[PDB]
Amino acid sequence: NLYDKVRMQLRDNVKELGNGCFEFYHKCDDECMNSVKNGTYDYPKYEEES
């Protein structure tokens, strides 16, 4: 449930590695990680691969 709670919060700004981890497509510093662990996250334009 944490895995999906987090996947839904993170949407497409991350990729699943298939081993229980999410890799970010943007620099995610302590302040970001602190946001991911609770009810918030918003990083709208970090696609490079698109």
Added chain:
Amino acid sequence: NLYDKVRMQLRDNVKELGNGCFEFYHKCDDECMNSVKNGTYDYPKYEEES
């Protein structure tokens, strides 16, 4: 189970908003919505973002 039944039926012609809702990438009128609620849906070329 409805969330996934619907996600599988809708595939990539929709996006998950992460709050229990699916946003369509195409105009989806009453006739479409009536199809989504039961065993049918087929909208092959509505990507704009691709």
